[PDB]
Design a binder for this molecule. Structure first.
Ligand SMILES: CCCCCCCCCCCCCCCC(=O)N(O)CCCC[C@H](NC(=O)[C@H]1COC(c2ccccc2O)=N1)C(=O)O[C@H](C)CC(=O)N[C@H]1CCCCN(O[Si](c2ccccc2)(c2ccccc2)C(C)(C)C)C1=O
Ligand SMILES: *[C@@H]1O[C@H](CO[C@@H]2O[C@@H](C)[C@@H](O)[C@@H](O)[C@@H]2O)[C@@H](O[C@@H]2O[C@H](CO)[C@@H](O)[C@H](O)[C@H]2NC(C)=O)[C@H](O)[C@H]1NC(C)=O
Lengths: 271, 98
């Protein structure tokens, strides 16, 4: 599925109070931040430059300088008429993606109070059906400046596809790396008298695709429930897989783990 | 819309009393973004805890990671306390190795 996108978070706590934050992401992994105190882009990894020159990054910096202030200052003055009420939040995401190693499409979507509001498609701003009349007015306003729309369209159409192929090949050795999990077993909460809950933790793995199952010999236990895959501060992943059993029938149980790092040798723990 | 937070606590490595480790607190699915997160040792705050940059999912809801070094002990109690406008009072989630 892999995509690249830039996000923008603006909040209008008070009349006296407001925050805004801009950053770039390659799926889950952060790669860029905008640093207002000095007014520059911040590369979080040495390969965050991709295949782009200083010349071009310089021009991209002029652009974000201008837009984030203008956009921010102008949503504040259009608020009274659009009937945005304090406090409120605005969110934007834009970028593009690849399906099987070729570019697939771009997007640019905007949200008000946690819900879809407007989107940018085929060189124009479009209103989201359930948002109603305030979303129509907002598009009326955003389409007036045809100049600024052609610039927005050239970022999504041309700059972004070149960027993501350059980013990915430059980050090759970090994204294609392989890291082996560890595993361990513990008691979970009892579902009721006469019964136990077995928990099996898997942690430290990269990449993300993993397989974990409770077993009786060769026979997979279909009561196995796996949870969410959760992040860990160093970049690797974490998971638990649980099973409820009558306590008389808990002998001869094991947890088995398969992952691309292990090179064929599955991890197996015995209860 | 307002959405209320989901709170998950976990350790990076299995507990071994007297050995350094990392305690995590993942807070996800909330809106709006205004939130207070703490990690507590014996119900008192922990200074210098670090967190990810604010980000959101495809359904617009926000998520954060909070984490810190810690050395678990036979008798020490560790938790995660969260406050959000969706909550009639602050919510605590204890870390239990079992
Ligand atoms: C860091 C990593 C870099 C990696 C490099 C790889 C290449 C990346 C390619 C992906 C580009 C995606 C765009 C994301 C922009 C963004 O997140 N921002 O935060 C920019 C701010 C606003 C975002 C968004 N739209 C725009 O930026 C466009 C669309 O229209 C205008 C615009 C037009 C006229 C004047 C000023 C402008 O900025 N700008 C957005 O929120 O839409 C509008 C700007 C919303 C808005 O604020 N409109 C108000 C405010 C004042 C400006 C326009 N206006 O009327 Si006067 C209004 O009534
Ligand atoms: C940055 O990279 C892109 C992508 O090119 C491909 O992926 C690279 C990592 C590398 O493997 C190249 O050999 C690949 O071609 C460049 O854009 C492409 O340019 C080629 C010609 O060399 C062209 O045939 C493609 O259509 C281009 N793809 C586009 C425009 O999406 C680009 O030139 C590189 N540099 C910059 C600054 O953009």
């Amino acid at each position: 599925p892999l995509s690249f996108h830039v996000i923008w978070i603006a909040s209008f706590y008070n009349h006296s109070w407001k925050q805004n934050l801009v950053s770039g992401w390659l799926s889950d992994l952060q790669t860029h931040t905008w640093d207002s105190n000095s007014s520059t882009i911040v590369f979080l990894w040495p390969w965050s430059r991709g295949n782009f020159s200083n010349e071009e990054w310089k021009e991209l910096e002029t652009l974000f300088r201008i837009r984030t202030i203008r956009s921010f200052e102008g949503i504040r003055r259009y608020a009274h008429e659009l009937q945005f009420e304090y406090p409120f939040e605005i969110q934007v995401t834009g970028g593009c993606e690849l399906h099987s190693g070729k570019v697939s499409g771009s997007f640019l979507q905007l949200a008000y109070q946690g819900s879809d509001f407007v989107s940018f498609q085929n060189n124009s701003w479009l209103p989201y059906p359930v948002a109603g009349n305030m979303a129509k007015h907002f598009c009326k306003v955003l389409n007036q400046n045809q100049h600024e729309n052609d610039i927005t369209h050239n970022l999504l159409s041309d700059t972004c596809p070149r960027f993501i192929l350059g980013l990915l090949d430059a980050g090759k050795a970090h994204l294609q790396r392989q890291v082996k999990p560890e595993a361990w077993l513990s008691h979970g909460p009892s579902p009721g008298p006469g019964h136990l809950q077995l928990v099996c933790h898997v942690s430290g793995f990269y990449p993300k695709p993993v397989w974990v199952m409770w077993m009786r010999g060769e026979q997979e236990q279909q009561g196995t429930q796996r949870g969410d895959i959760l992040p860990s501060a160093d970049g690797t992943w974490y998971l638990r897989a649980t099973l409820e059993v009558a306590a008389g029938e808990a002998a001869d149980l094991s947890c088995r783990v398969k992952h691309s790092s292990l090179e064929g040798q599955d991890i197996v723990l015995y209860w | 819309i307002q959405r209320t937070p989901k709170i998950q606590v976990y350790s990076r490595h299995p507990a071994e009393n007297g050995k350094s480790n990392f305690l995590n607190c993942y807070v996800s699915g909330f809106h709006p973004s205004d939130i207070e997160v703490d990690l507590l040792k014996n119900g008192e705050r922990i200074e210098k805890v670090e967190h990810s940059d604010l980000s959101f999912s495809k359904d617009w809801s926000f998520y954060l990671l909070y984490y810190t070094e810690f050395t678990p002990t036979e008798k020490d109690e560790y938790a995660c306390r969260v406050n959000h406008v969706t909550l009639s009072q602050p919510k605590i989630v204890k870390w239990d190795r079992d």
